[PDB]
């Protein structure tokens, strides 16, 4: 009921985009090849870290069941509300539970894996329900994780 | 004075990256075709899709799981 026949086929098709040699497992090398075609340039360690999150049996690569497991999972089923709220709290220096749109854009476009201005615009529209320019991040994180 | 100041300095980059990865996870949801900006970002660095979109999703899920891990370290 969660996964449909068509969803499973789509995910099997996606798996083959990563599994270049067709041996049923995605390696760090194969993941690196895909990400470089997507414009990214990760390190071997970064590639290893990504596989480590998906590689349930710890054999160093991702097979289709591990891939499907990861892809069938919704953000709501990762039990991440506390971590994501804690991360927003870091930028609420005053602690009043609000971060302005301007503060969020300043941080999101200049630190870390910078968002484009368009992506921040999308985030603000999604989060600032009442349009007052202040993001109640607890409500935002609740909606993303519930 | 610089009490919580040094701690903010230590947490800010993993905090931002978790928010960013979480947003890109959320904003590539196939049931929200109104959310286009994260796709336009990836589009500006790769031309259409269709199975390319699911692979981007896979990259976003994996980057979110890693950034969640790094945040709790
Ligand atoms: Ca392979
Ligand atoms: Ca494995
Ligand atoms: Ca505040
Ligand atoms: Ca608001
Ligand atoms: Ca609430």
Q: Which two tokens stand for residue A7?
A: 């969803």
Chain B residues within an 8 Å CB radius of A140: none
Nearest to A127 by CA among A104, A93, A107: A104
Domain boundaries, chain A: 1-75, 76-145
Q: Report angle CA A119, B43, A101 to the nearest 5 degrees.
A: 5
Contact assignment for A71 to B54 by CB distance below 8 Å: yes
**Elucidation method:** X-ray
DSSP-assigned states of every residue in chain A:
--S-HHHHHHHHHHHHHH-TT-SSEE-HHHHHHHHHHTT----HHHHHHHHHHH-TT-SSSEEHHHHHHHHT--GGGG--HHHHHHHHHHT-TT-SSEEEHHHHHHHHHHSSSPPPHHHHHHHHHHH-TT-SSEEEHHHHHHHHH-
Chain A, 61-100: which have a CB under 8 Å from a chain B CB? 67, 70-71, 73, 75, 78, 80, 83-84, 86-88, 90-91, 93
């Amino acid at each position: 009921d969660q996964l449909t026949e068509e969803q499973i086929a789509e995910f099997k098709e996606a798996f083959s985009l990563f599994d270049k040699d067709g041996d049923g497992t995605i390696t760090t090398k194969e993941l690196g090849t895909v990400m470089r075609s997507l414009g990214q340039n990760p390190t071997e360690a970064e590639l290893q870290d990504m596989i480590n999150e998906v590689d349930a049996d710890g054999n160093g690569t991702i097979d289709f069941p591990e891939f499907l497991t990861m892809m069938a999972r919704k953000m709501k089923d990762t039990d991440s509300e506390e971590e994501i709220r804690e991360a927003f709290r870091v930028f609420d220096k005053d602690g009043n539970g609000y971060i302005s749109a301007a503060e969020l854009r300043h941080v999101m476009t200049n630190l870390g894996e910078k968002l484009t201005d368009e992506e921040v615009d999308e985030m603000i529209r999604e989060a600032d329900i009442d349009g007052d320019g202040q993001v109640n991040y607890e409500e935002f994180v609740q909606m993303m994780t519930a | 004075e610089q009490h919580r100041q040094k701690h903010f300095e230590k947490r800010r980059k993993p905090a931002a990256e978790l928010i960013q990865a979480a947003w890109r996870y959320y904003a590539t949801n196939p049931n929200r075709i109104d959310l286009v900006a994260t796709w336009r970002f990836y589009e500006s660095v790769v031309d259409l899709t269709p199975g390319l979109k699911v692979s981007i999703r896979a990259v976003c899920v994996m980057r979110f799981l890693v950034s969640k891990r790094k945040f709790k370290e």
